Each structure stands twice: as C-alpha cells, then as structure tokens.
Amino acid sequence: VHEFFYSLLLFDLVYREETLLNVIKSVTRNGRPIILTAALALILVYLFS
Amino acid sequence: ETEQDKEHTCETLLMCIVTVLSHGLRSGGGVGDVLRKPSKEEPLFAARVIYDLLFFFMVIIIVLNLIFGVIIDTFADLRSEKQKK
Amino acid sequence: QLARHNKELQTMLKPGGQVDGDEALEFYAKHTAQIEIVRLDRTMEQIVFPVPSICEFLTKESKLRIYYTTERDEQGSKINDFFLRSEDLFNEMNWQKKLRAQPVLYWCARNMSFWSSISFNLAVLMNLLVAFFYPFKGVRGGTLALIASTILRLIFSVGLQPTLFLLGAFNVCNKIIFLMSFVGNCGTFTRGYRAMVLDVEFLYHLLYLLICAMGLFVHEFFYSLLLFDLVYREETLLNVIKSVTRNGRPIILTAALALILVYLFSIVGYLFFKDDFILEETEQDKEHTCETLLMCIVTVLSHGLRSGGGVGDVLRKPSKEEPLFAARVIYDLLFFFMVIIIVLNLIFGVIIDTFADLRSEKQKKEEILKTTCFICGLERDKFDNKTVTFEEHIKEEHNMWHYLCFIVLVKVKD
Amino acid sequence: PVPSICEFLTKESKLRIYYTTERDEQGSKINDFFLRSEDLFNEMNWQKK
C-alpha cells in the first residue's frame, strides 16, 4: 500500500525507549478532565456563538 | 464554472454558526475579526466593540490557557511523585 | 468485660472471629463500639453501650460526607467540625424512617440517581439538536446515553418541530421527578448549621427548572442555558474553574492594571502620533476613511489589542520618514513587549499559581486523611506502628462513626 | 545456602523488582514483593531449559 503503513511504524518508534513517555503522561494520567474541559470551551464558543 | 471560486459571497446565516465562529477560533488572534467592518456606525459600533473584546479575553486566556494550565499542573504532580519515590 | 484478661476470653474472641456463624455473635456485629473517651482528668476510659436504632437506619452518605467534609480549623482537624455535623446528622437520620412510612417516595431515592441521568443526557442532546437543525425549513435527515437514540427515531417520523416541543415537555416532567428526590432526601426543609448549601441547592434546582419553562416558549436561549449548567456539574471540571474564582479577587483588578497600561500608553500615541489608518448609500461601507481623532482612543488601541499580534500595527505606515520613523519604532516595540508579555501573561501567570496552591492543599489534606489518624491528633505512623496495630485501631476504637452514634444516644430515655 | 534456580537468574530480576515496587499502604511493603516473588520463581526456572 502507499506507506501510510510505513509512516505509522515511524510513529511507534518515536513513542519508545524513555522519557518521551514521561512528557506524554502529562496529558494522559490526569487526562480525564481536559477532554471535558474542552467542552467548557466548546460551550463558551457556543453560548457566545 | 471552472474552479472552486465564488464572486465573494458566503453569508453564513442559519446553519453552522458554531463553525463560523470556530473558523475564527482557529486563528487564535482576535475572534471577532473574521466577522468584520464595524465602521463607526452609531447604534451598533459601541454595541459590539465591547462584545468582541469580552469574547476574546475570556475565551482565549481562560480556556486556551487553562487547557494549558492543567498540563503544567500535571508536571509538578508527576515529577514530585517520582522524586519523592 | 472479658476483655483484659481471658484466655477463655481469647476463646470469646474465638466467639468473635473464625467464621463460626452464630447469630448472637453476628448480631453483636450490630454493635461493639469501644467508644474510648476521657473524663475531666486522671483518666483513659473506654465505655460501651449498644447502638441506637436511628444510627442503624442511616444511609451511605453520612459516613462519606462526614469524612470528606471535615475542616482544618485549628491545631488538628478536631471535633469542632464533627460536633456541628453530628447534630445535624442526628436530625437528618430520624427523617428516614417516616419516609419509609410512605413508600411511594423511595422510588424518589432511585430518582436521585435519575435526576442526573435525564437532565444531563437530555439537555445536551436537545440543545445540540437545536443547534444542529434550526427549524421552520422542511428537511430530511440531512447528513450535510442510550434511550435518547431510541427517542430520536420515534420523534423523527411525525415532523421534527413537533419533536422539539415534545422533548421540552418531557424534560420538564423529568425535572419535576428528580427535584422531588432532592427534597425527599432532606425533608421538612430541616435546618442545620450550613445555611449556604441548602439554600443554594433549593435555588439552583429551581432556576434550572425555570429556564426550561421559559425555553419552551422562546427561541432556545433557554435551551442553551440549561446545557451550560449540565457542563458545570459532576466533578473536577469544578476543580479547574476554582483556579479562577477562589483567588479570583486579584485578577479582575489586575486586568485594570492592563486597562491602564493600555490607557496611559494610549494617551501618548495620541499626542505624538496622528491616527494613520485609512484602509478599513446602500450598505455599511465608506470610501476608506475613519480617522479616530478625539473620542475613544482607548478603543482604537483596544482595536489593536484584540489581535494580540503587534499593537502598533493597526495604526500603520511608518515609511522611513526621518523626524518620526525612529521616533515611534521604539515606542511600538516597547508597547508590545510590555503589554503583551507582562500582562497578557501575568493574567495567565496568576492562574497557574492558583493550581500549585489549589492541588497542594488537596494532596496534603488527603495525607492528613489517610496517613494521620482521625480524631486523636495521632501522628499515625511511628506511634501507631509500634503496637497491637495501627489500622484496626481505626477500626476498633477511634471509629469516627462510632463516636457520633454514642452522641445520639444521649437523648433516649427517662 | 542458595538454591540453584536463583543462582541462574538474569540481570533483569533485580532491576525490575526494585524499581517496580508499589507504595500500597504504610510503607512499600511486602505485598508487592510477594506477588513479584511468585512470578519470579516461575520465570527463573524457564531459563535453563
């Protein structure tokens, strides 16, 4: 196929080894609030909308 | 017609008004700027100037930074557990 | 009474544990308190008396509410808080059984769960659906949290303005039912110590209902406002908005420090600089001439404040001209630097400060909830570690629930 | 004296165990160690065959 399959393998390579894992735990471990926090933004763009 | 081109007329009236504001949300700068042409006109000029400023302040700093604000909180939480451990 | 000495008492303890299922022994399970209090001085007593019936009826909420609610008023999160709570708690516990006297309300406790379900799910779907399709145009499905999908199909057949009306009515009925469960849970509007909570709850729920009624009879603005409340509830979205409210006094006046930095600077740009913005009957159109000279010069700089980028850029055309070119270049750079970073980031700067303040209080407070003892001021670890045990002397004698049911038995008899 | 399986080992066992831990309760105590130990014994035998 057109590489899309190749690019996706590169994405996993950057995910591994070490403390790049640390900085992405910033958005995942306490990851529950921010996606609903975005809906507080999505309604502030709405009501004002 | 040949290509995706109009004689400069869109006029989002009724449908997806949350997207045409999301059209202006995407530039970060301003918010109200996408809508345009206030132009001194007395019963509406001072009527919306304040509105755009209010919108801008609130949306951008308040959310587009507290959506960043939670992220650094998740650093001082996350490292301090590791350095205590 | 067999406590301090028996080997046979150890065998009584054998009565006590070991999975021998005998009802009398189990029933004590109903009570074993070991209250463990002091008199005026000289003393380290423990007293016991069986449980009181009202306490036995309970809830689940009482224990939960009490531990979490606390306070830390003084040198230890001591009894003051507990005492106020206890008085209110006793009165609240009695109300429960004469609600069991009239059984058609208990469904109302189940509706304490439902209020939530309907209102939250219903509102968002309805408000979003309104946004998705504005009425008065005849339209198909138009391609351009379980029961609601079923309802969507049914409403879809008959015409969809019709569906909108019906949903609003449905919502009102649901509101009435849950409302009833909130009131059922605390009855007679019985009074305690916390005035704010009860009053706000009554009002808030009423306000939530009214908007629905107004909306049924107006362009939804009433519908959208109900969606705003739905996003406000449940949980830690409340946390991140306390960042801007608890330490909320300074930032609104901090904004006026920005509002005067746009002002003082605003004035110079008047005197040492003409306006220099030219390029902006049937329609709202001019032949490219505004020239804000005299009136609202703080707004035409606020016109440039709004883009964030630059500041001076809105004014325009410096163009190499010697007595003024180097004269204002520095001015715009100075303005830009100062206003934007300094305020438009310290107005953000205070916000993250209100995170490291706000969480650190909460993470310290759990450490004084899980790893200090409850009310004996006990530095739970070393001291408790050396003896019989730590953890079960929470469960045996310093039981915070076992104090308060001893307090309610003081008004029983004769 | 030591037991032979333990003597065969790896390098991973020691590393994994210390770092892995837990802090479950009043001290990062033995609970964690015990679960890990059982799994570890089985893993160590697999090495010689």
Token pair in block for residue B71? 């992220």
User: Best interface-test mutation with B: which of A34, A36, A47 has the largest number of B CBs within 10 A?
Assistant: A34
* Residue C212: Cβ within 10 Å count: 22
C255: helix, strand or coil: helix
Q: Does B81 touch chain C (CB under 8 A)?
A: no
Residue with tokens 């106020």: C84
Alpha helices in D1-49 (DSSP H): 4-8, 12-20, 30-45
Q: Which residue of B has its CA nearest to A36?
A: B67
Taking the Cβ of residue B21 and every Cβ of chain A, the question of whether any pair is shorter than 8 Å is answered with: yes
**Chain C residue with minimum CA distance to B16:** C132
Which tokens sit at C399? 């039981």
The dihedral over CA atoms of C293, C294, C295, C297, expressed in degrees to the nearest 10, equals 60
Q: DSSP string covering C167-227, please?
A: HHHHHHHHHHHHHHHHHHHSGGG---S-HHHHHHHHHHHHHHHHHHHHHTTSSTTHHHHHH
Residues of chain A with C-beta less than 8 angstroms from the C-beta of B74: 25-27, 29-30
| Residue B60: Cβ within 10 Å count | 19
**In 3D, which of B57, C373, C15 has the Cα closest to residue A44?**
B57
Residues in chain B closer than 8 A to A45 (CB atoms) = 18, 21-22, 25, 59
Report whether C173 belongs to an annotated binding site: no
Residue to substitute from A36, A44, A49, interface C, most C β-carbons within 10 A: A36
Give the residue ranges of the annotated binding site of D for ATP.
11, 14
Structure's resolution in angstroms: 3.9
Q: Which of residues 100-139 of C touch B (CB under 8 A)?
A: 131, 134
Are residues C358 and B77 in contact, defined by beta-carbon separation less than 8 angstroms?
no
Q: How many beta carbons lie within 10 A of that of residue C383, not counting itself?
A: 12
Helix (H) / strand (E) containing B67: helix B64-84
Query: Is C108 labeled as ligand-binding?
Result: no
Distance CA C36, CA C396 (A): 10
Place of tokens 């869109």: B10
Is A23 in the C-facing interface, judged by CB distances under 8 Å?
A: no
Give C237: exposed, middle or buried? Use CB within 10 Å, 0-12, 13-18, 19+.
Answer: middle
Q: Which residues does C12 contact at the CB level (< 8 Å), separation at least 6?
A: C2, C6
Which residues of chain C have a CB within 8 Å of the CB of D29? none
For residue C148, how many other CB atoms are within 10 A of its CB? 15
The minimal CB distance from C309 to the residues B29, B41, B52 is found for B29
Q: Residue C229 carries which side chain, given as an amino acid letter?
A: D
Check C228 against A47: CB less than 8 A apart. Answer: yes
Sequential DSSP letters for B24-71: HHTT-S-SGGGT---TT-HHHHHHHHHHHHHHHIIIIIIIHHHHHHHH
| C137 annotated to a ligand binding site | no
Query: How far is Cα of residue C305 from the mean position of the Cα atoms in its chain?
Result: 34
Whether D contacts C, i.e. 3 or more CB pairs less than 8 A apart, is: yes
**Interface contact C389, partner D, CB < 8 A:** no
Cα C241 from chain centroid?
Answer: 9
- Whether the CB of A27 is below 8 Å from some CB of chain B: the reply is yes
Kindly give, in sequence order, each residue whose CB lies less than 8 Å from that of residue B66, ignoring residues fewer than 6 positions away.
Answer: A37, C240, C243, C244, C351
Dist CA C343 CA A14 (whole Å) = 37
Q: With an 8 Å Cβ cutoff, is C291 touching chain D?
A: no
Cβ neighbourhood burial of C126 (10 Å; 0-12, 13-18, 19+): buried
> Which token pair is C150?
């079923």
Smallest Cα–Cα separation from B78: which of A21, C230, C141? A21
C201 at interface of D, judged by CB pairs closer than 8 A: no
The token pair at A28 is 């995942």
Question: Chain A residue with minimal CA distance to C223?
Answer: A47
DSSP letters of C348-391?
HHHHHHHHHHHHHHHHHHHHHHHSS-STTT--HHHHHHTSS-ST
Q: Which SS3 state, helix, strand or coil, does residue D25 take?
A: strand
d(CA C413, CA C410): 8
Set of chain C residues whose Cβ sits within 8 Å of the Cβ of B53 = 302, 305-306
Q: What DSSP state is assigned to residue B63?
A: I
Chain B residues in contact with C240 (beta carbon < 8 A): 66, 69-70
Q: Which helix (H) or strand (E) holds B71?
A: helix B64-84
Terminus-to-terminus CA distance in chain A, angstroms? 43
Distances C139 to B13, C142, C158 between C-alpha atoms, Å: 17, 7, 13
Q: In this structure, which amino acid lies at residue C140?
A: R
Q: How many CA atoms lie within 13 A of D40 on its CB side?
A: 20
- Confirm whether residue C288 is marked as ligand binding: no
Report yes or no: C236 at the A interface, CB cutoff 8 Å: yes
Residues of C in contact with B40 (CB under 8 A): 286, 290
Nearest-5° Cα angle at C279, C273 to C281: 125
Chain A partners within 8 Å of C131 (Cβ): 46
Paired tokens of D9: 């080992």
User: With helix as H, strand as E and coil as C, how does C33-69 read?
Assistant: CCCCCCCCCCCCCCCCCCCCHHHHHCCCHHHHHHHHH
Tell me: is residue C205 an annotated ligand-binding position: no
Name the token pair of C277: 């913005």
CA–CA dist C280, C257 (Å, integer): 30
Question: Which residues from B are below 8 Å from C344, CB to CB?
Answer: 61
